[PDB]
Design an enzyme around this catalytic site. Structure first.
Site, PDB file in Angstrom:
ATOM      1  N   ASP A 380     -26.026   2.929 -12.276  1.00 32.18           N
ATOM      2  CA  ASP A 380     -27.417   2.748 -11.866  1.00 32.18           C
ATOM      3  C   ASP A 380     -27.561   1.583 -10.850  1.00 32.18           C
ATOM      4  O   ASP A 380     -26.973   0.536 -11.011  1.00 32.18           O
ATOM      5  CB  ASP A 380     -28.239   2.515 -13.118  1.00 32.18           C
ATOM      6  CG  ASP A 380     -29.699   2.522 -12.845  1.00 32.18           C
ATOM      7  OD1 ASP A 380     -30.267   3.603 -12.714  1.00 32.18           O
ATOM      8  OD2 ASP A 380     -30.273   1.427 -12.786  1.00 32.18           O
ATOM      9  N   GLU A 409     -25.307   4.999  -7.421  1.00 30.75           N
ATOM     10  CA  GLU A 409     -26.669   5.332  -7.081  1.00 30.75           C
ATOM     11  C   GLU A 409     -27.307   4.275  -6.194  1.00 30.75           C
ATOM     12  O   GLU A 409     -28.290   3.662  -6.578  1.00 30.75           O
ATOM     13  CB  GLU A 409     -27.541   5.519  -8.312  1.00 30.75           C
ATOM     14  CG  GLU A 409     -28.945   6.029  -7.960  1.00 30.75           C
ATOM     15  CD  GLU A 409     -30.043   5.285  -8.664  1.00 30.75           C
ATOM     16  OE1 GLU A 409     -29.739   4.376  -9.445  1.00 30.75           O
ATOM     17  OE2 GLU A 409     -31.239   5.571  -8.403  1.00 30.75           O
TER      18      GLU A 409
HETATM   19  O1  LIG Z   1     -36.629   0.670 -17.796  1.00 29.49           O
HETATM   20  C1  LIG Z   1     -36.430   0.442 -16.390  1.00 29.49           C
HETATM   21  C2  LIG Z   1     -37.133   1.381 -15.351  1.00 29.49           C
HETATM   22  O2  LIG Z   1     -36.398   2.640 -15.157  1.00 29.49           O
HETATM   23  C3  LIG Z   1     -36.898   3.411 -14.022  1.00 29.49           C
HETATM   24  O3  LIG Z   1     -36.243   3.524 -12.750  1.00 29.49           O
HETATM   25  C4  LIG Z   1     -34.817   3.554 -12.835  1.00 29.49           C
HETATM   26  C5  LIG Z   1     -34.349   4.948 -12.384  1.00 29.49           C
HETATM   27  O4  LIG Z   1     -34.485   5.970 -13.410  1.00 29.49           O
HETATM   28  C6  LIG Z   1     -32.906   4.774 -11.928  1.00 29.49           C
HETATM   29  O5  LIG Z   1     -32.208   6.009 -11.786  1.00 29.49           O
HETATM   30  C7  LIG Z   1     -32.925   3.954 -10.633  1.00 29.49           C
HETATM   31  O6  LIG Z   1     -33.833   4.399  -9.597  1.00 29.49           O
HETATM   32  O7  LIG Z   1     -33.279   2.617 -11.006  1.00 29.49           O
HETATM   33  C8  LIG Z   1     -34.283   2.347 -12.014  1.00 29.49           C
HETATM   34  C9  LIG Z   1     -33.732   1.238 -12.952  1.00 29.49           C
HETATM   35  O8  LIG Z   1     -32.548   1.628 -13.683  1.00 29.49           O
HETATM   36  C10 LIG Z   1     -38.389   3.754 -14.078  1.00 29.49           C
HETATM   37  O9  LIG Z   1     -38.788   4.523 -12.926  1.00 29.49           O
HETATM   38  C11 LIG Z   1     -39.150   2.430 -14.207  1.00 29.49           C
HETATM   39  O10 LIG Z   1     -40.574   2.679 -14.137  1.00 29.49           O
HETATM   40  C12 LIG Z   1     -38.667   1.629 -15.455  1.00 29.49           C
HETATM   41  O11 LIG Z   1     -39.401   0.395 -15.507  1.00 29.49           O
END
Ligand SMILES: OC[C@H]1O[C@H](O[C@H]2[C@H](O)[C@@H](O)[C@@H](O)O[C@@H]2CO)[C@H](O)[C@@H](O)[C@@H]1O
Ligand SMILES: OC[C@H]1O[C@@H]2O[C@H]3[C@H](O)[C@@H](O)[C@@H](O[C@H]4[C@H](O)[C@@H](O)[C@@H](O[C@H]5[C@H](O)[C@@H](O)[C@@H](O[C@H]6[C@H](O)[C@@H](O)[C@@H](O[C@H]7[C@H](O)[C@@H](O)[C@@H](O[C@H]8[C@H](O)[C@@H](O)[C@@H](O[C@H]1[C@H](O)[C@H]2O)O[C@@H]8CO)O[C@@H]7CO)O[C@@H]6CO)O[C@@H]5CO)O[C@@H]4CO)O[C@@H]3CO
Ligand SMILES: OC[C@H]1O[C@@H]2O[C@H]3[C@H](O)[C@@H](O)[C@@H](O[C@H]4[C@H](O)[C@@H](O)[C@@H](O[C@H]5[C@H](O)[C@@H](O)[C@@H](O[C@H]6[C@H](O)[C@@H](O)[C@@H](O[C@H]7[C@H](O)[C@@H](O)[C@@H](O[C@H]8[C@H](O)[C@@H](O)[C@@H](O[C@H]1[C@H](O)[C@H]2O)O[C@@H]8CO)O[C@@H]7CO)O[C@@H]6CO)O[C@@H]5CO)O[C@@H]4CO)O[C@@H]3CO
Ligand SMILES: OC[C@H]1O[C@H](O[C@H]2[C@H](O)[C@@H](O)[C@@H](O)O[C@@H]2CO)[C@H](O)[C@@H](O)[C@@H]1O
Lengths: 649, 649
Positions: A380, A409
């Site tokens: 991540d 990612e």
């Molecule tokens: O609990 C943390 C956070 O997760 C989210 O975004 C993630 C996403 O799913 C990942 O794949 C990548 O884009 O980075 C982020 C952090 O791991 C939620 O969208 C967010 O609202 C939430 O706070």
């Protein structure tokens, strides 16, 4: 000692970081090694690539050719075998036979020095004969020598005897090489097939529950696996499987305060129940997870776990290792960010107080999951942790377990994206979702399949839980169909996030890439059975695309790709090849209107003559066509997204 | 140890051969060092260039800036000092004050955590203060600290106190740098002014004789030197000054058999009278040559000797070192070639039987002439001898005598051309004579002044004894005028071959670049006195161009060059700068028709605003103009070739 050798061989490519990091391949993949080779004076050169395996053993005679006349840029294709660290060298040399031949062909018809010239060729051929191990081939070159020297015969005849096809073939296999010079070796890391080739499916186990127990377990979620195998996927990427914090937990639709039943975001990892080495208690135990992994294994599915190096406020690290977080003067830790996105539910890690402890714990966590059969990690947001940290972690894990694959990612700027691949990430997420026009797709894939392919392996997820692109929002099912096709045929690795098949395309609001009622913040049960019987799923298309991939080697590589012109901006055409397998795709990128175009194929680029007409089969329908230099296609959205054609033997 | 550092600094440029050969500069020359610098997360970085002299001493604080937003490519200008081998490093670091400032400016107006944010800035400023050596500068930052911490004052006010101009200037000079990370050092060879800057004149001493003795001597040819000095030249390049073979000597106009009195080609070096360490007896003795060199020195002229590593059939090497030649089976040596050009009068050298003996003798010859004050060698056709041979020779001579300059007459393909410059040739002949249109000139000079400038220094000869371009043939005097202007203003080194001034433009035949009755094969006396009184010479223009060069530092560098658009294809415009000196040139490339055009200056590229109107003086005429964004020019061939303007201060 001079930097340049006797016969200059310069600027060998591929090169990464000036030779400080290895260039990449996977077993059975082909790519071009090139160099700049030339010499002083006017005599000809030749060159060849010497590829060495991990025990130092040279590969087969691999002659290079000048890629374009008068450029001095030479190349040849190589093929990676078993996994491990290889090396490649380019050897350059004077090619005195080609030179002699050139002059002989002018001078002998001109009556100029015919005896002296023929004797000079005699001597070249003798030296060539001495290096030839085959007895028959040696006899053949020596019979040419005698002929060249036979002053009883006409000059034109003596020369012809030295230019017969069977003489050429011996010299093609065993040339006389003067003044052989080598480049310094360059390193190549050869990794397993799955690093480059694979079809990925992402779903949240907790959504696959029951009426009595809505929050799914590993045991209930295992029931989805057969349907995923049947769609021809190879890898199941799970979001974080760990306990989820309660402090500042988010509610449905990314609201700030969770209510009584809200399940929270899986990336807000850690609670008193455990951290990154634990299983969320509502998914079950470690034994259950072993069961899920065993059952996936039997269906030909590998698991990829999410690894998100970050914590909820309730992760045990917060109190056990406070110096792994940056504290403001009042003691508090600022919640993570990716502005304007806020992650109130998590704390980011600070790496400069105890880098060694973070490294040691990180690899221990990865090794824990490795001991339970997870040989792939989807990392991540790696670009918010230090680049040298990933370099050290990956080297450490691949030192003992070179089969493990890391997917980065990193949705960020190019430099960082490139650098992470170069320091060891086997796969990268890419800008794919934001390449939807023919210009965008053509440019970006020209980039990915070109020089970038020596360090980056792209994973084309047509959607993620964080990206529902406007093109799918506005395009409906036909847009989902086009993107599937593109993803699956343009990159040898692709993926979808569950719900893609059902054409879920309702955004949080106009101009957002977030899903409404996102699965990140709620359980999302789905009537899979109904969709299959009512035919409102594109699973059959997805299944067919993966089968085609499995059946055509050309789609299991990246680097051989060519874009063929069309007279319509909405219609794109391209071909990919691997040995005798050729796949030709034509896609209508308009999801709302039928498009008719003329597709003008670069025939030589298919290895055909301009006038030729090759038969093809559209593997989506089973229909057959006879195609050549210019071809009318008519593509109606909803009926046909594309033609995905194989060229018949 | 990881390949990437804590704060990534990657792909530092310039780089030549991946760091295996040095980048080039000369004393007082400026060029851009660049690098790819970024970090993880969203906080700011900075970077700076640390340039080291031969004794290892660091130069001044040289901060870099991002060259374009979001690119992560950073640069700064540096300036080479004394000659010798230098090194440059790029340091990259977190810039926590720029980061804090950014957030503070948002949060404080927002009332969000104002006390905590301000205390965080206080602590940053304290750390920065601790590293500041000045007491006054330290007092100033600490006064900001106290203000930032004064909880009795309004947030907006406490912040403002930390963003005053006098706080900025202290931090600009002594930033707080977190996690400082360096690249590996890259090498820079700094050579003397003349390697980059100089005006060259070529003539054949033997042509400057008398009525009684047509074949000129060094004593008679010394009389031409004042005229050459008067024209503002710095370097006199002589064709080979050695004895000339008699066997297969060429006659007038490149005929095959010389007749009784024909003098032959100077490049057909060697007879029983001597070789490359000898003086042609008809030019006199070594003492006469010393006289010629002394007299040149007093007029501000350095001599450059031709060095052609090749022999006539009568050179002593032919019998004394037969293994320095390739012999055919009947014992004969094929005469040299550059097809379709034949050199029946010379033998080329073979290097592979006795490379050590050739090296030793070659550097002994060069040292001989060096001991007689020749510190510049124009190396004839270097690309027909091995590249590594020049690399070894030059390193050997520059090891003891780093001031010696080698000019590579390599009219050949780009790879070889680049490589010879890279392995140590201080100067290169170029494709200039074949760049005559605006597109050609613009593209080629963009190339020479760009990345190629880190290893190649161009010498723009507008003509040579071997190149009389069609443009001069068809253009007459006005064409000679234009090419002089272009050559002298576009490259800081240029040259002409005697006769250029008199606009000699009669070819051997239509479609040839050879001169009729070429001076290579005959004595060519010229009535210099008559040309001067009749005004049929362009010496005055030549003289003026060199004076302008001598008076304007912008014309004595290469890398700063910019092309300004015009609405006429025949009319080209460009500017060059060095400190406050700016030269602006506009040339009508049509030699037969008057051209009027509008020249639209890139004002910011001059460092002016778009609306500004700056005065200029055309240094050819002494006339003054007021020029700005858009300027009408009218240029009549014969009257005005160009405007060569300085911007007035
Ligand atoms: O609990 C943390 C956070 O997760 C989210 O975004 C993630 C996403 O799913 C990942 O794949 C990548 O884009 O980075 C982020 C952090 O791991 C939620 O969208 C967010 O609202 C939430 O706070
Ligand atoms: O026979 C092949 C060739 O024939 C035709 O060319 C004729 C041409 O049309 C006429 O105009 C004339 O050309 C003269 C030219 O106009 C003058 O300017 C000068 O040329 C100089 C160049 O200006 C200068 O740059 C330099 O050129 C170098 C190149 O920049 C550099 O790229 C490299 O060149 C190589 C090419 O890049 C590479 O493609 C390959 O050349 C192939 C051509 O591209 C291909 O189209 C074909 O070319 C034709 C041409 O198109 C016809 O018009 O043949 C080649 C296949 O191998 O290799 C090149 C290297 O050989 O290096 C060159 C220099 O080596 O130098 C030249 C002069 O130094 O002079 C020209 C002649 O005096 O005449 C020609 C025929 O004589
Ligand atoms: O900054 C002011 C900026 O404001 C406006 O931007 C709006 C834009 O027009 C809308 O279309 C939309 O933007 C979205 C975009 O269209 C979506 O497709 C997606 O974009 C993704 C990219 O497609 C994808 O490639 C990747 O982007 C990377 C780039 O490819 C990569 O090259 C690099 O980008 C850097 C630039 O190359 C560099 O030039 C510099 O960019 C500046 C622009 O050059 C400058 O003109 C200006 O642009 C205006 C714009 O005209 C308005 O439309 O600002 C830029 C910042 O200085 O810096 C770039 C580094 O940031 O790196 C990126 C990855 O960061 O990913 C993206 C998204 O994941 O999403 C876009 C988000 O909306 O809305 C915006 C308003 O934000
Ligand atoms: O007499 C030998 C040979 O020399 C000439 O060409 C030179 C030329 O002047 C140089 O500038 C360069 O191109 O190399 C050549 C060889 O040294 C004559 O022009 C030629 O005809 C002559 O045979």
């Amino acid at each position: 000692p001079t930097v340049v050798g006797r016969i200059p061989v310069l600027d060998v490519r591929p090169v990464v970081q000036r030779g400080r990091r290895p260039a990449k391949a996977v077993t059975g993949e082909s790519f071009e090694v090139s160099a700049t080779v030339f010499r002083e004076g006017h005599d000809a050169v030749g060159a060849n690539v010497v590829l060495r395996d991990p025990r130092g053993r040279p590969g087969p005679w691999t002659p290079m050719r000048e890629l374009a006349p008068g450029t001095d840029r030479w190349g040849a294709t190589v093929t990676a075998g078993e996994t491990g660290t290889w090396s490649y060298t380019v050897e350059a040399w004077g090619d005195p036979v080609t030179t002699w031949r050139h002059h002989a062909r002018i001078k002998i018809p001109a009556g100029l020095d015919t005896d002296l010239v023929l004797e000079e060729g005699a001597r070249l051929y003798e030296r060539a004969a001495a290096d030839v191990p085959g007895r028959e081939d040696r006899r053949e070159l020596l019979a040419a020598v005698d002929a060249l020297r036979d002053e009883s015969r006409p000059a034109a005849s003596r020369l012809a005897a030295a230019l017969t096809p069977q003489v050429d073939a011996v010299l093609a296999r065993h040339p006389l090489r003067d003044l052989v010079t080598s480049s310094d070796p360059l390193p190549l890391l050869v990794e397993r097939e799955r690093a480059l080739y694979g079809a990925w499916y992402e779903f949240f186990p907790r959504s696959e529950g029951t009426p009595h127990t809505p929050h799914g377990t590993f045991r209930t979620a295992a029931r989805r696996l057969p349907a995923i195998a049947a769609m021809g996927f190879d890898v199941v990427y799970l979001p974080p499987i760990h306990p989820i914090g309660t402090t500042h937990r988010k509610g449905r639709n990314n609201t700030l305060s969770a209510t009584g039943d809200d399940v929270g975001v899986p990336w807000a990892i850690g609670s008193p129940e455990g951290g990154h080495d634990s299983i969320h208690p509502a998914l079950g135990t470690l034994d259950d997870f072993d069961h899920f992994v065993t059952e996936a294994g039997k269906l030909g599915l590998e698991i990829a776990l999410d690894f998100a190096l970050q914590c909820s406020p309730d992760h045990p690290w917060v109190h056990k290792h406070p110096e792994w977080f940056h504290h403001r003067p009042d003691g508090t830790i600022a919640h993570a960010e990716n502005p304007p996105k806020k992650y109130q539910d998590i704390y980011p890690i600070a790496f400069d107080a105890d880098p060694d402890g973070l490294a040691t714990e990180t690899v221990r966590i990865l090794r824990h999951w490795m001991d339970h059969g997870v040989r792939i990690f989807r990392v991540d947001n790696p670009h918010t942790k230090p680049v040298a940290f990933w370099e050290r972690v990956i080297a450490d894990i691949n030192g003992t377990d070179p089969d493990v694959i890391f997917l980065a990612e990193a949705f960020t700027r190019p430099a960082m994206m490139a650098t992470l691949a170069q320091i060891g990430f086997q796969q990268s997420y890419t800008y794919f979702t934001w390449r939807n026009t023919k210009q965008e797709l053509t440019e970006y894939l020209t980039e990915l399949s070109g020089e970038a392919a020596s360090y980056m392996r792209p994973n084309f997820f047509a959607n993620t839980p964080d990206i529902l692109h406007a093109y799918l929002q506005h395009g409906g099912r036909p847009a989902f169909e086009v993107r599937a096709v593109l993803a699956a045929t343009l990159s040898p690795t692709w993926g979808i996030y569950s719900g893609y098949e059902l054409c879920e395309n309702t955004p949080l609001r106009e101009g957002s890439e977030e899903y409404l009622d996102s699965e990140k913040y709620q359980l999302k049960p789905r009537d899979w059975t109904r969709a299959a019987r009512e035919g409102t799923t594109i699973a059959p298309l997805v299944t067919r695309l993966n089968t085609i991939r499995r059946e055509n080697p050309a789609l299991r590589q990246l680097r051989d790709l060519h874009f063929h012109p069309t007279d319509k901006e909405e219609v794109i055409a391209y071909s990919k090849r691997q040995g005798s397998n050729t796949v030709l795709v034509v896609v209508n990128l308009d999801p709302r209107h039928t498009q008719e175009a003329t597709v003008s194929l670069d025939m030589p680029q298919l290895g055909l003559d301009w006038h030729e007409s090759v038969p093809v089969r559209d593997e989506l329908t089973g229909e057959t066509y006879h195609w050549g230099r210019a071809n009318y296609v008519r593509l109606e959205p909803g009926r046909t997204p594309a033609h995905v054609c194989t060229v018949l033997r």
